[model samples]
Target chain A: GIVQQQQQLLDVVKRQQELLRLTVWGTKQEWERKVDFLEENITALLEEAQIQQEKNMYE
Target chain B: GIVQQQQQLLDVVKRQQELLRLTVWGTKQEWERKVDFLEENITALLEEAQIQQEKNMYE
Candidate 1:
């Protein structure tokens, strides 16, 4: 059970290096998107973990 | 319960430098051993989360 996809998530975030770079020099929207993406992905992963936990219990 | 488990998982992954370094520079067998250990530990934790979820679901 890949309860927490930290590595994968980290990789994803790292891939957004360009996005981060842009945000540093770009508009507020760029920074906002990065922040939103991080939050969304992390939350989604946590939710998935909870769902998996529930599924495992029933099985 | 699920939120806490994800946080713990993140902590474990963050310490990967200390845990993952052994897997990187060591011999192939040694690396595999370390990987095996991590996989087992993570799996066990996930299973525990599953059990906890199951218990919660029925209660």
Candidate 2:
């Protein structure tokens, strides 16, 4: 379950990054902003994984 | 330059994830441990990118 969710999150990240690369419409500043946002999204997902892991440990 | 480095980092992440998926070894705990390690790696890389962006802003 953890792997499934994390895999989905990673796929979403990869897709978003590919979109950013293909579009090529953003300036460097905007590009960096988008990447920054993606990183935050990833951080949140990882945090969720960590919480799930801890829960598993208790069970 | 930033994009180049970040792209490389993302590629590394993809490669590692692919390895995990294909290996078909390791218990669920072991797999989760590896994923946890990867999340830390990604976090470190994102921090590096944030620093680079900040430096670029001043330059």
Candidate 3:
């Protein structure tokens, strides 16, 4: 269900801060890593959302 | 300091979960709003990073 998928996304977003902190206290490489992490997570969530969107369309 | 600005950005990102929750239980409008929020925040952070990057360049 969209509800469940949405909740999963929320959970993922909640962890962003932990990753973000690394950027603040880390070296340039760490900063880059954090951004990569965020992008990857966001991309994954969006892909999941698109899948759900398509499912909803057929429903 | 880059550290302070990074902290501020982290704080903003930390709140993404709260806004993301709105999408979970909300309508399509809410979902769209969450995407907008993420984009805005990410853009702001990247802009800040670029600024810091330049500052470091001259340092």
Candidate 4:
């Protein structure tokens, strides 16, 4: 369970790292699309928040 | 679970109803803060998708 958990952490962290790598595309559709993308994966992402929150705060 | 499901649907749909609200706040921090807010609730949103996907599509 530890290894699987750790793997989840690794994957989540990597994807989240890219999550904020933004540069102001300045398109409303761009942001909306990002949110849309998030919606698609929101299931796994719920678990991701738990993992990330245990070690980090987004602030 | 119908009542619980209905309530969840109500709350989620109302919030999602407003998720697209904007008037080009046009500030980086504004957009970033919105994204930050989404990250916080991303967990529950995962469940929201499973709920919405049955009758709704983001397109």
Identify the runs in model 1 with alpha carbons over 4 angstroms from their true place: A1-43, A46-59, B1-28
Per-residue alpha-carbon lDDT of model 1 for A1-59, expressed as tens digits?
34345335445444443444344334334434544454445445545544545654453
Each candidate's B-chain TM-score, in sequence, is 0.46, 0.50, 0.50, 0.34
Q: After superposition, how far is residue A54 of candidate 3 from its true place, in Å?
A: 0.4
lDDT of 3 at A56: 47
Could you tell me which 10 consecutive residues in candidate 2 chain A have the lowest summed lDDT? Answer: A19-28
In order of appearance, the predictions have TM-scores of 0.31, 0.31, 0.29, 0.24
TM-score of chain B of 4: 0.34
Question: Which 10 residues in a row give candidate 3 chain B its minimum summed lDDT?
Answer: B19-28
Full-model lDDT, candidate 2: 0.48
What shift in Å separates residue B32 of candidate 4 from its native position after superposition?
Answer: 8.8
Give a tens-digit lDDT track for model 1, residues B1-59: 44444453453333332323332323236757766787778667756766765665564
**How much DockQ does model 3 earn?**
0.02
What is the overall TM-score of model 2 with all chains considered together? Answer: 0.31
Candidate number achieving the greatest lDDT relative to the actual structure? 2
Q: Is candidate 2 or candidate 4 better by DockQ?
A: 4
Which docking band does candidate 2 fall into?
A: incorrect
In the range B16-39, model 4's lDDT, one tens digit per residue, is 324422312332456576555544
Minimum summed lDDT over a 10-residue window in model 1 chain B is located at: B18-27
